[PDB]
Design a protein around this ligand. Structure first.
Ligand SMILES: CC(=O)N[C@H]1[C@@H](O[C@H]2[C@@H](O)[C@@H](CO)O[C@H](O)[C@@H]2O[C@@H]2O[C@@H](C)[C@@H](O)[C@@H](O)[C@@H]2O)O[C@H](CO)[C@H](O)[C@@H]1O
Length: 587
């Protein structure tokens, strides 16, 4: 094994920072990115605490579809990255880079990435120590005849150089199963047997109308636990709102895939954190997002989605490393072997732990994410683990998985009920993680959680998550319900018919809207109420270390009822928020 160029694990997670080449400006002799970020400026802007855990991911976007264009652009940017000087210290500090080398089946009619040979990639790895990996993303809809062979070569050339091959894919049309050899294309299967320690496999939740979120995430987790990938994660994509035909928040009717550039702006900001929790809580450690202009920002500035949700989430997962592979294995009661494509795809989990066919969220944490691997693979390495002795490894074709009812009846005997209420909650050590799982319905949810004898009841609006940690002197609370008002994008349309017929915002129009109406002059959402009730408290708790998004929260209300040894905490906010409550339990 060649020394790894970086660590990627729970203690060293990875936030990919995408920069998409501007092919129109490339044709005019300029080297630029859509949205106006620059490589140096973007890197400089990344907070210093995050720099060790962030890597610039170049994407060739709409570079011309001709030999040389992607190599030219990439070598230009690799040079810029290599020569970077920290202006505070005057030292050359090469910027870490990942190159997007494969997308859309690398068809010559889809991408300039077609003209990037493995020979060239090897040369780049050898020339640039700061090239830490290469990325394949989104080919499920154009599954090239040689995709598995090409993936084997990407993994091998990465292993040769100590880099990572990162593949983001969704299990549409059995993509993940095929990747590992389902239909007889076994080159990548063979490559993984040798080089899995250099592989990162991620979901890509873009094709949301096909409903493969839960099954793809299950595979990513299972591939990791069974030593078919070094780590896993997800690419979470606001284009899901387009794919599913949604429009104005909470409005009725479906507009189809008709208003793309308005639609990718509309997903509530905090919902990205709800999606990201599914990665974190299940041991994933790699994060990426689209559309970059909304999720990261423009012109070397952080968008509010980035600053108030993603940045704070990613800081959290650095400060509180995700559960290790060993820990997740110890916790796993059921591991599925077999093809979700034969058992209804995402329908497998509907009314088990997801509330509908097309959602990136879960409705209960009772089973967390049940891990699986495709039928083509073997569970030999999983069984060899010292930590897998208490796992029931079950064929997907088992009677226990034959129906919705059967799945719950089986799982419920191995995963006990551990909270009450129709809300998402999952516990890890002394922390309850909670969110309202509604996607586009304006409905509050409630739950009852316990820390031993201490009872905590919560009431959450949609697009709200919280982390509640029992600490020696009370409770640490992190809350995020950040959701700006996107109604302006949908003005002039009083119904779905009218909305479908709006003028197209366009790509350039959406970037301009971000500049003019999101980076500045933001239409913030209204403050909204979260309630937290603690039962089993000695005296009025004290609040400590209150902070959050500027201008986004009223002072929390504490109403202590001595007779009933309980406090009701009322928060009115729209943003991230953190505080501690100090108290003793009543006995
Ligand atoms: C045609 C277009 O609008 N291109 C943009 C767009 O691309 C997205 C978008 O079209 C969605 C619709 O659901 O489909 C893809 O996910 C697409 O992603 C882009 O193309 C695919 C094949 C991959 O290469 C992927 O990595 C890439 O992002 O939005 C993206 C930004 O989110 C770019 O701005 C494209 O130019």
């Amino acid at each position: 094994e060649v020394d790894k160029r970086r660590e990627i694990n729970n203690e060293h997670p990875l936030l990919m920072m995408p920069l998409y080449a501007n092919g129109e400006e490339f044709n005019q002799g300029k080297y630029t990115f859509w949205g106006g970020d620059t490589l140096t400026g973007k890197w400089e802007n990344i907070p210093d605490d995050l720099k060790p855990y962030t890597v610039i991911q170049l994407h060739p976007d709409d570079l011309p579809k001709r030999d040389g264009a992607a190599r030219d652009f990439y070598e230009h940017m690799l040079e810029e990255a290599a020569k970077y000087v920290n202006p505070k210290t005057g030292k050359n500090e090469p910027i870490p880079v990942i190159l997007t080398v494969y997308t859309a089946g690398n068809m010559p009619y889809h991408t300039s990435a077609h003209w990037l040979s493995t020979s060239w990639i090897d040369k780049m790895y050898q020339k640039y120590p700061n090239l830490h990996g290469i990325f394949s993303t989104e080919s499920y809809w154009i599954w090239a005849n040689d995709i598995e062979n090409k993936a084997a070569d990407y993994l091998k050339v990465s292993a040769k150089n100590g880099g990572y091959f990162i593949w983001a894919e969704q299990n549409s049309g059995s993509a993940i199963e095929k990747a590992f050899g389902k239909n007889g294309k076994i080159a990548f299967q063979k490559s993984v047997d040798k080089y899995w320690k250099n592989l990162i496999f991620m979901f890509k939740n873009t094709p949301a109308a096909e409903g493969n979120d839960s099954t793809t995430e299950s595979y990513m987790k299972g591939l990791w636990l069974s030593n078919h990938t070094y780590q896993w994660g997800g690419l979470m994509d606001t284009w899901k709102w387009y794919e599913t035909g949604k429009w104005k928040l909470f409005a009725s009717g479906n507009i189809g895939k008709s208003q793309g550039d308005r639609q990718w702006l509309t997903e509530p900001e905090s919902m990205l954190g709800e999606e990201a929790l599914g990665v974190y809580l299940n041991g994933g450690v790699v994060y990426n997002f689209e559309h970059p202009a909304y999720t990261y920002g423009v012109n070397n500035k952080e968008s509010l989605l980035f600053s108030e949700v993603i940045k704070e989430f990613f800081r959290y997962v650095i400060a509180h490393p995700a559960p290790s592979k060993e820990k997740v294995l110890e916790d796993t009661k059921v591991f599925i072997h077999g093809d979700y494509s034969n058992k209804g795809n995402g329908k497998f989990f509907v009314n088990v732990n997801t509330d509908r066919e097309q959602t990136p969220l879960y409705m209960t944490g009772r089973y967390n994410v049940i891990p699986a691997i495709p039928g083509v693979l073997k569970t030999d390495k999983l069984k060899e683990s010292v930590s897998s002795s208490r796992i029931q490894i079950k064929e997907i074709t088992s009677p226990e998985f034959s129906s919705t009812q059967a799945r719950k009846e089986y799982l419920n005997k191995l995963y006990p009920m551990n909270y009450e209420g129709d809300i998402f909650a999952q516990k890890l050590d002394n922390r309850w993680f909670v969110y309202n799982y509604k996607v586009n319905e304006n409905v509050k949810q409630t739950g009852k959680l316990k820390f031993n004898s201490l009872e905590m009841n919560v009431e959450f609006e949609p697009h709200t998550y919280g982390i509640f940690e029992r600490i020696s002197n009370g409770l640490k609370v992190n809350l995020n319900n950040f959701r700006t008002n996107k109604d302006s994008l949908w003005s002039n349309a009083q119904d779905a018919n009218q909305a479908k017929k709006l003028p197209q915002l366009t790509k350039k129009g959406a970037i301009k809207w971000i500049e003019e109406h999101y980076i500045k002059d933001t239409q913030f959402g209204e403050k909204r109420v979260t309630k937290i009730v603690l039962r089993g408290i000695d005296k009025l708790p004290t609040i400590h270390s209150l902070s959050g998004t500027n201008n986004s929260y009223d002072q929390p209300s504490l109403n202590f009822d001595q007779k009933n040894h309980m406090v009701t905490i009322t928060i009115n906010s729209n943003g991230n928020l953190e505080f501690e409550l100090h108290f003793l339990e009543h006995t």
